Structure formats: structure tokens, C-alpha cells
Design a protein around this nucleic acid. Structure first.
Ligand SMILES: Nc1ncnc2c1ncn2[C@@H]1O[C@H](COP(=O)(O)OP(=O)(O)OP(=O)(O)O)[C@@H](O)[C@H]1O
Lengths: 834, 71
RNA sequence: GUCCAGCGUCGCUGGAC
């Protein structure tokens, strides 16, 4: 039942008995010291960096002070004169006690005989002090010695200080009437060069039975100190001459063995005591804890309502990163529990203090600021941006790629799970995830930028560039420059660079179907069966020409190559959602790449009235933007949510391009059976995969909802039919209706991405409908549910029957893309029937 | 059979019958040291359906987690 | 038994009656 108040000064020395954590360990070690003197005697309290290494020592001394042991004042070699030997400091502190005891004694004439004996020993120590601070031997002192005295009956002749100091301690023990004297040192983390003089003055002058030494430090630091003093023993001319690998091993072992005999002799193993971290005291998940720790988050809080330390961080991480109640949120908190005590408490103290004053909001901002000032050292070695003013979109996109580069795992790197073995990568990961919840919170436009640029860059580089330890990063520098990530540019510009990188590698048979892209034709083909022809751009209408225009990209290397990348639609949607007003972005986004961008292959290559129809398309978009403003305030994305969405989306696209690749047929016009694939069907499933990936795990990982409505069953993606996509749509429908929860308040992401006018033509093209006795049952039910969620009825009765059976003016439907040819197909064979 | 049946989800739900499961059953039961009442509880806990995920160092870790562990 | 779909590179798996 330990209560910690965050509003206390929280200094290392500010901890009282009630504030002290390891109360059980303190009494255990006090007993060990008391027992030992009753029957080398050097104790080493070992503790990691920033874990009570000073407050614990003070408590141990206080318990001893209040078989008699007189505690010397604690000393630290770091806050001392540089050249002053330890023996001088200890002798000075001994002098104060005995002089204070003698003067305060004032009984009879004992302080007339004892004082002379004590003063005699000090003069002897002062005479022999010159041995400590001599840079050379002085021969005139030879006659100064050999003036042998029978006093104290020294075991060995000479001017050795160790024997003289020993008799000095014996006299003080008699005067003070104490069994032994306790000398307490302190850690040397700030400046560990001063720790060598401590070690020499312990192995030489403190070896009696009247002295107990309690040292503090870190063995991982003391060993480096000792090993450094060992290599200074080898003759330099030898180290630089015998530089063979066989000889280096021989001298390597003779030192790693010499230091261990030094440590195992100076700090005996049976006396070392290791401090306890937070995880040991609290426990793992539901495991019972050794002790009980509680914290207070407000000056007005009552001591009977203080919550557990695990729960205090649990809420600071749940809403800090916008994560739900689950195992993945419990993994972040468990990592924090293993942090140093000082760093763990400081980030908590900063977060809860700032949050309380703000209420008197942007909760993740407080967490990000607290983390930034906490692990600010790990950022520098990681190399991320440290400028507060440059915190932005592309700077964050740079941070994700660099962190993945250091981790060297392009598959699950963007998940930002602190699972790296290295400590710097683990520390840098939690800070990064906070920043994602910062920028992407409350805005749909930034969310689509993180998904497409933050995670798209990593995955594409994995499959198309990395398929020599200096060529690898040579490409990385080459790749980062080509995609121009880091500069402030729109996502639509990034789509074209994405298109160029993928298209360089030609797949088998050189078919013009790639990952989420189709390579349309520019020149004219000869003897093409059926109504297959070139893609004539000026045959579309309002709300369909704009959809195509925003979905067209061109690369101008060698011959001119056209494309129909689905990545452009995602980028174009992001730009519309950004400006949200002024009617100019919707005018400018539709015409940004058609005739201005002249992309070049990467250097690693080896080769109706127009006025009255367009404003109607424009006005619908403005209506869509109006709805977005009032609903998108409730978006709470998390780094896990964005990272997972790209994973399912990327896997889905790779399958669709690999299953429709060889299904092109000479009579694939207006494809009605699932075994026939045209150009329009491929584009239909490319935009369907994106609409499906959001739906599946908007319920699983979003923070607004506390549970999921998918139900139970295998999670599958639509690649040839919409049976899977419709099946999930229905099941959530009754679950969201039996319990009264609207689609807007549970799946805000999916609701907005399903009502965008840009994607409406692509959902139901002319040549992308499965017309069959069984298939049309699902497609019609698919149509009814989509319209019910959107509210608006996209397809009227006439056009729907026109599409299903087998020219009506169309504005919300692609009409000519299926007839367009695809490079490399040649459409020789014919569809097989069975 | 229920004591010796365990399933693994890698790419498609795989079903296994391993002798190592039987040793696991005997090891769990034998540490009861309880009366009749707890035997029914312990015996019922031994027989169940357990699905375990593929180790990370395999080529189907991401797909297995994506497909979900269910029926 | 039969039909639809999904994963791997024919085999595996889900679902329906
Ligand atoms: N018993 C305790 N209860 C609460 N907090 C503690 C306790 N002991 C230590 N701390 C925390 O540790 C911080 C500093 O600890 P300490 O000074 O002992 O470690 P150090 O900085 O590694 O060591 P040194 O100051 O000797 O170099 C304090 O500010 C406090 O927040």
C-alpha cells in the first residue's frame, strides 16, 4: 500500500519512508550488515541506471544510524576535487567525529591522554602522505624512514600507509565505543573516470575487520573501467607490432579473464544485492504482485481512491495512442513498466500534470510532448527530426521509412510494434506511434496520406527494388530521392512516381496488368475481334470523365505509356478532402497530371454541353464534402489501424492482378461470367479491395467502438466475386440494427469512403458485372445494401436492368473502359465453357 | 481422441493428432491431488479444441494472422 | 453427394442444400 503523489517535488532526496518503494529490501540488507559484524566485508548494491541508486543508500544509512556501528557521512567521488585522494577525504571525516566526541565528552581527563594518542597517529599519517602524490622517487626520504619505533608493534617495517591507517581506525573505535565503522560510497555514472581511485583505495587501505564498505554503481560500467586499466599494462610497441588475428584472440582472453578475477575478489558474489524494477514488483498482466503501488493524479484526489500504477499508464496509453482495449494496447504498457524508475515517473508526472491544468484538448499532444522530452537521446541516434517547428506530414513520412530502414524488416515494420531487440529502436517506436495519432486525428485527408505514403513507400521498395552491403543503401539513397519523399508534395504526385517504379519490371508474357494498375494502349491494333478498340477518352460524361481523368497517369520514357492506376484515385480523394472549400481544388484536382507531368524511369532501369454537365458533377462533390465536415471530427486512427489496413490492401491487390492476368479472352466483352475478365472488371475489383479492407478492420481496431460486429468466421477478400464483401455487409447490418447503433457512429471511415462520388462510377461498370442465375442474387442484394447505407439511390431502375441483361446516356457509370485493349494480350484464345 | 486432437492455422486450418498431446494430457491430470469434484473440472479442461499460430520465422505468419482463427 | 467461393504451388480450406 504505497501511495505516490505526482505533485510532490519528486527529488531523489525528497523520498520519505512512505514514499520509498523497496522497503522490504532495505531491512533485508540492514540485517546482513548487522549479522556480518557480529560474527573482506565489502557490499555492493547493484542497480540499473536511474533506479533509486542514491535514495536507497540514504535509507540504509538512516536505519543503521537510529553491537554498535557508527555510520560515516555518504561520499561521492564525482563531487570532489579532482586530485584529492580518497584516503584524505575519509581521514577528514573520521577526524570530525572523534574531535566532536572528545570535546563533547568533557569527563575527567580522558581527553588529555586519548587526545595525545589520536594526535600522534594523525602526524604519522601526515608524514607518509607524500608517497600517494609523488611523480618520482625522492632518495632523501630513505633516511627519513628506518627510524623504527616499537609503537603499535607493526608487523612489517616500512612507510606503508595501510598499517598506519589501520591503527588509526582502531583508536577511533575505542574512543567512539563502536564495534565497527561503516563507509558508504555513491555511484559514478556522471563521471566514471573517478571510479578508479575508489577501487584502488578499497583494495589497499580498507581490509580490516572494523570497516564495512557499501558501494553503489553499475557493473556494466565498472567492467569497462577495469578493462581499460588492463590494456594500459601491455607494452604499446607490442600492441602495434603483433596485429595477427591469432594473436589478437590470445590477448583478448587474457584480459577478459584478468578483470573477472579482479571483480570476483573485490566485490564478492554472495554480498551483491540487485534492486527491483517496476515489472518485478507489480507483476505481469493478472499475475499476483509482490508489493502494492498506487498513484495519485490530482491534488484533490483521496488516498482511498488512488488507482494502481499499471492502470495509470494503461489509460495514458489507451487514449494517448488512440488504442482499444486489447492485447496490442497491453504490449505498449508492459514495455513502459521495464523503463528506468526515474524516466517512468517523469513521463507520468509530466503527462498527468499538464492534462489536469488543460481542463483546469488534444490528449495525444501531451503524450507526444512528454515522450519527446523523455527519450530525446534515442531520437538523435535514430536520426529522426528534432525540430519542433518542422513537425509535419512529410517529416513524419520520413521518420517511418528511416525507422523501418534501421529495423530492417519491411513486412511488419510499419506496424510500429516495439518488438526490436535493440533498446534505441524500442524507445523510438513508441514515440513514433504517438505522432501518428497526433497528425491523423480528426482529419480524413491526412489519414489517406499516411496510408498511401507512410506505408506505401516501404512495401513497394521491398518487392521492386530489393530483388553486397554498399549497393543496398546505395539504392536506398537512390530510391528516397526518386520518390521525393521528404519534400512537401501532394499525394497525387506520389502516385505517378509509384506507377513508374512498378512498371519497369516486366512480368511473364509481358501482359499489361500490374499491382493495382492496368497498362492501356496508345497506338492502333490490327485485326482485333469484336468491339475491342483503343481507349477513346472523349466518350465519357460528367462525373465519369472526371473519375477517369483523376485515375489516369502517364510516363514518357522511350515510347509513351498510359496507365489506369488505382493509386491515383486514393491520392485524388485526399486532395479534395484537404481544401474542403473554395470550389477551386475540385476544379484543379481533376486536372493535375493529364498534360503536365513528364515522368521518367528511375536511373536503375535497364531498357451534351460541357458547361451544363461538369458543374453537376462538381456540385455532388461539394455535397459530399459538406457531410464529411460534420462527421470526420470523430476519427481516432492509430498506428496499428493504418498499418494493418495497408497489409490487407496490399495482399488483396497482388492476388487480383495475378488471377485476372491470364483470364483475358477474345470475347471477354461485357464480361458476364466469373471466368471472363476485361479491363473494367480489373479496375472494379481494385477499387473494391480498398473499400473492403477498411470495412473488415474498422470494426476490429478502431477506438470509437468497444467491440466488433463482424461476428465469427474466416476473413476473406473478394478476388473474383462479391460474395465475401456482401456477406460481411449483411451480417453487420442486423447486428447494428438489433442493437440500435447507426453506421455513422461505429464505422465513420467506411461511411465516408463509400459515399464518395468519385468511386461511384467504378463500383458498377458496364463490363464488370457477374450475370448468372445464382450470381445475380448476390449482386442485387449488394446493390440494395449499398444504397441503403448511402441513402442516395445511385442506379435507377432502367440503367440497372440495362447493365444486368447485356445507348442510354450515363453519368454515374463507366461505359467504354471494358472495350479498351490491354498491352501484350493479343486476345488469341477464347473462353472455355464446361 | 479429444485429448489427442490439436489444430494449427497456417494457410488453411490444419488438423493434427500428435502423441505429444497425450503426454500433455497425462502431465496436466497427474498434478491434481484433489477430490472427485475437481476431477470433472480438470478432465473437462484437458479435452477441448486449441488452435495455435505459426511461429514468426515461417513464410505464412502474416497470412495466418490475417485470415483469423475461427470456423 | 453437388454447386459456389478462398489459400498455397494440383493440393488444401470455408460455405450452402
Ligand atoms: N523510493 C522511491 N520512490 C519514488 N521514486 C523514487 C524512489 N527512489 C528513486 N526514485 C526516483 O528516482 C529518481 C532519481 O533516482 P536516483 O537519483 O537514486 O538515481 P540515479 O540518478 O541513477 O542516481 P544518482 O543520483 O546517485 O546518480 C528520483 O527523482 C525519483 O523520481
Amino acid at each position: 500500500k504505497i501511495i505516490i503523489n505526482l505533485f510532490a517535488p519528486n527529488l531523489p532526496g525528497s523520498t520519505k519512508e512512505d514514499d520509498l518503494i523497496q522497503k522490504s529490501l532495505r531491512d533485508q540488507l540492514v540485517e546482513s550488515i548487522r549479522n556480518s559484524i557480529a560474527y573482506r566485508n565489502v557490499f555492493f548494491v547493484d542497480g540499473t541506471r536511474g533506479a533509486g541508486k542514491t535514495t536507497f543508500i540514504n535509507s540504509v544509512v538512516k536505519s543503521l544510524n537510529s553491537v554498535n556501528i557508527k555510520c560515516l557521512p555518504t561520499i561521492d567521488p564525482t563531487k570532489l576535487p579532482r586530485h584529492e585522494p580518497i584516503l584524505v577525504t575519509v581521514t577528514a571525516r573520521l577526524n570530525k567525529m572523534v574531535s566532536d566526541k572528545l570535546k563533547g565528552y568533557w569527563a575527567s581527563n580522558d581527553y588529555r591522554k586519548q587526545k595525545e594518542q589520536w594526535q600522534n597517529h594523525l602526524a604519522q599519517l601526515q608524514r607518509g602522505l607524500h608517497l600517494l602524490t609523488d611523480k618520482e622517487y625522492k632518495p632523501e626520504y630513505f633516511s627519513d624512514a628506518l627510524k623504527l619505533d616499537a609503537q603499535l608493534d607493526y608487523s612489517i617495517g616500512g612507510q606503508d600507509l595501510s598499517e598506519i591507517f589501520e591503527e588509526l581506525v582502531k583508536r577511533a573505535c575505542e574512543i567512539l565505543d563502536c564495534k565497527a565503522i561503516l563507509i558508504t560510497f555513491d555511484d559514478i555514472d556522471t563521471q566514471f573516470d573517478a571510479g578508479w581511485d575508489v577501487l584502488e583505495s578499497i583494495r589497499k587501505f580498507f581490509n580490516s575487520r572494523k570497516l564495512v564498505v557499501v558501494a553503489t554503481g553499475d557493473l556494466r560500467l565498472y567492467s569497462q573501467l577495469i578493462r581499460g586499466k588492463q590494456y594500459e599494462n601491455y607494452s604499446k610497441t607490442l600492441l602495434e607490432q603483433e596485429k595477427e588475428s591469432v594473436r589478437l584472440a590470445e590477448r583478448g582472453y587474457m584480459v577478459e579473464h584478468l578483470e573477472q578475477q579482479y571483480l570476483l575478489k573485490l566485490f564478492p558474489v554472495q554480498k551483491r544485492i540487485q534492486l527491483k524494477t517496476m515489472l518485478q514488483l507489480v507483476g505481469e498482466k493478472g499475475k499476483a504482485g509482490k508489493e502494492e503501488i498506487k498513484v495519485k493524479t490530482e491534488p484533490g484526489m483521496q488516498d482511498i481512491d488512488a488507482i494502481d500504477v499499471r492502470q495509470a499508464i494503461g489509460d495514458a496509453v489507451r487514449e494517448g495512442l488512440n488504442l482499444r482495449e486489447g492485447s496490442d494496447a497491453d504490449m505498449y504498457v508492459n514495455e513502459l513498466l521495464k523503463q528506468p524508475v526515474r524516466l517512468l515517473m517523469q513521463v507520468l508526472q509530466d503527462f498527468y500534470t499538464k492534462k489536469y491544468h488543460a481542463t483546469s484538448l488534444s490528449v495525444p499532444n501531451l503524450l507526444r510532448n512528454a515522450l519527446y522530452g523523455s527519450m530525446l537521446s534515442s531520437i538523435y541516434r535514430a536520426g529522426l527530426n528534432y525540430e519542433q517547428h518542422r513537425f509535419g506530414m512529410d517529416s513524419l513520412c520520413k521518420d517511418i521509412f528511416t525507422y523501418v530502414k534501421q529495423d530492417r524488416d519491411f513486412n511488419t515494420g510499419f506496424y510500429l510494434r516495439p518488438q526490436s531487440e535493440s533498446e534505441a529502436l524500442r524507445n523510438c517506436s513508441i514515440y513514433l506511434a504517438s505522432q501518428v495519432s497526433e497528425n491523423c486525428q480528426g482529419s480524413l485527408s491526412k489519414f489517406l496520406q499516411m496510408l498511401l505514403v507512410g506505408c506505401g513507400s516501404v512495401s513497394i521498395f521491398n518487392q521492386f527494388v530489393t530483388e553486397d552491403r554498399e549497393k543496398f543503401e546505395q539504392l536506398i539513397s537512390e530510391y528516397v530521392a526518386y520518390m521525393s519523399v521528404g519534400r512537401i508534395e501532394s499525394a497525387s504526385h506520389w502516385a505517378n512516381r509509384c506507377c513508374a517504379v512498378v512498371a519497369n519490371s516486366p512480368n511473364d508474357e509481358k501482359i499489361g496488368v500490374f499491382l493495382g494498375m492496368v497498362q492501356l494502349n496508345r497506338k492502333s491494333r490490327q485485326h482485333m475481334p469484336g468491339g475491342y478498340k483503343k481507349f477513346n477518352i472523349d466518350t465519357e460524361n460528367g462525373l465519369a470523365k472526371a473519375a477517369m481523368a483523376s485515375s489516369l497517369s502517364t510516363v514518357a520514357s522511350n515510347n509513351l505509356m498510359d496507365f489506369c492506376s488505382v493509386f491515383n484515385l486514393i491520392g485524388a480523394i485526399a486532395d479534395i478532402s484537404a481544401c474542403r472549400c473554395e470550389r477551386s481544388a475540385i476544379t484543379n484536382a481533376f486536372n493535375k497530371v493529364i498534360a503536365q507531368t513528364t515522368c521518367i524511369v528511375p536511373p536503375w532501369s535497364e531498357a451534351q454541353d460541357d458547361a451544363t454537365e461538369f458543374s453537376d458533377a462538381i456540385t455532388k462533390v461539394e455535397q459530399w464534402l459538406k457531410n464529411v465536415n460534420e462527421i470526420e471530427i470523430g476519427i481516432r486512427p492509430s498506428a496499428l489501424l493504418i498499418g494493418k489496413v495497408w497489409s490487407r490492401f496490399y495482399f488483396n491487390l497482388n492476388n487480383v492482378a495475378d488471377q485476372h492476368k491470364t483470364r483475358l479472352y477474345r470475347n471477354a466483352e461485357h464480361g458476364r461470367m466469373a471466368s471472363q475478365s476485361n479491363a473494367a472488371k480489373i479496375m472494379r475489383f481494385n477499387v473494391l479491395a480498398f473499400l473492403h479492407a477498411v470495412l473488415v478492420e474498422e470494426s476490429l481496431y478502431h477506438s470509437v467502438s468497444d467491440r466488433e460486429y463482424i461476428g465469427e468466421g474466416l476473413r476473406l477478400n473478394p478476388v473474383t466475386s462479391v460474395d465475401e464483401f456482401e456477406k460481411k455487409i449483411k451480417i453487420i447490418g442486423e447486428k447494428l440494427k438489433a442493437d440500435n447503433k447507426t453506421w455513422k457512429n461505429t464505422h465513420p471511415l467506411f461511411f465516408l469512403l463509400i459515399s464518395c462520388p468519385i468511386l461511384h462510377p467504378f463500383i458498377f461498370p458496364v463490363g464488370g458485372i457477374n450475370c448468372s442465375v445464382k450470381a445475380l442474387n448476390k449482386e442485387t442484394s449488394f446493390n440494395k445494401l449499398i444504397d441503403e447505407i448511402v441513402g442516395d439511390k445511385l442506379l435507377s431502375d432502367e440503367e440497372w436492368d440495362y447493365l444486368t441483361k447485356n445507348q442510354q446516356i450515363f453519368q454515374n457509370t463507366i461505359t467504354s473502359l471494358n472495350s479498351s485493349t490491354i498491352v501484350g494480350a493479343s486476345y488469341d484464345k477464347d473462353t472455355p465453357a464446361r | 481422441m479429444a485429448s489427442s486432437l490439436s489444430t494449427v492455422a497456417s494457410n488453411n486450418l490444419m488438423d493434427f493428432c500428435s502423441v505429444f498431446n497425450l503426454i500433455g494430457a497425462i502431465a496436466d491430470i497427474s498434478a491434481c491431488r484433489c477430490e472427485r469434484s475437481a476431477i470433472t473440472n480438470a478432465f473437462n479442461k484437458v479435452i477441448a479444441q486449441t488452435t495455435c499460430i505459426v511461429p514468426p520465422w515461417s513464410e505464412a505468419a502474416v497470412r495466418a494472422e490475417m485470415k483469423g482463427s475461427s470456423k
